[PDB]
Amino acid sequence: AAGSTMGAASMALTVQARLHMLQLTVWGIKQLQARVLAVERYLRDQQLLGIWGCSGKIICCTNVPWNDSWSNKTINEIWDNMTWMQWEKEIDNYTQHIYTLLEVSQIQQEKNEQELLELD
């Protein structure tokens, strides 16, 4: 119910997953831009997931605590009883803080500590 809990309105689904010569014509140039852009957007998300160690995940679990200054609501107030769009707005100002925390130490230290453990 992971995709059903965060509001009934989760129905945007994955239209983004659903998604001749290159003639530089009035419509052709626009078609080129559309293809180049689709690639760029895909990679920006994939690279960020790669950085956090979430490259192969749909849902990834991390070692960074929730903090609670971003939002002090609980699991049944945030995860349940809420729609994803509302949620992203509620913590929009912490996007960079959180992304920074998801990489810093969380991937960087985790990997350096493993490097040391793997020497044994």
Partner 1 sequence: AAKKWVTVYYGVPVWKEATTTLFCASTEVHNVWATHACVPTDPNPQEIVLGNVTENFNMWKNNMVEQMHEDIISLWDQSLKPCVKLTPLCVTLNCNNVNTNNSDWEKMETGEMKNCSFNVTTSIRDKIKKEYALFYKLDVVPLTNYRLINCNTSVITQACPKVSFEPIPIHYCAPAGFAILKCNSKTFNGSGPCTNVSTVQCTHGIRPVVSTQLLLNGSLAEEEIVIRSENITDNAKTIIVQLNEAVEINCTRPNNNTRKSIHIGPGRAFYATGDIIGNIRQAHCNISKARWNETLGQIVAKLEEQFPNKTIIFNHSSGGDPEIVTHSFNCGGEFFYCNTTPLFNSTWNNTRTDDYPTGGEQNITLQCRIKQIINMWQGVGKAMYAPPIRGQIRCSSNITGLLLTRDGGRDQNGTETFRPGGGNMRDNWRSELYKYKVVKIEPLGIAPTACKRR
Ligand X SMILES: *[C@@H]1O[C@H](CO)[C@@H](O)[C@H](O)[C@H]1NC(C)=O
Q: Which residues of the shown chain bind its own copies in the complex (CB under 8 A)?
A: 2, 17, 21-24, 29-30, 32-33, 35-36, 39-40, 42-43, 46-47, 50-51, 53, 55-59, 61, 107-108, 111-112, 114-115, 118
Which tokens go with 44? 């920006």
Nearest distance in Å: CB 111, its own copies = 5
- Of 31 and 70, nearer to ligand X (C-beta) is 70
Which tokens go with 114? 């493993």
Q: Which of 96, 52, 48, 51 is nearest to 70 (CA)?
A: 96
* 84 vs 67: CA distance, rounded Å: 20
CA atoms within 13 A on the CB side of 71: 18
**Residues 51 and 107 sit within 8 Å (Cβ to Cβ):** yes
Catalog residues that contact partner 1 under the rule CB under 8 A: 2-3, 6-23, 25-28, 30-31, 33-35, 37-38, 41-42, 45, 48-49, 52, 54, 57-68, 71, 74-75, 78-79, 84-85, 87-88, 91, 95, 98, 101-102, 110, 115, 118-119
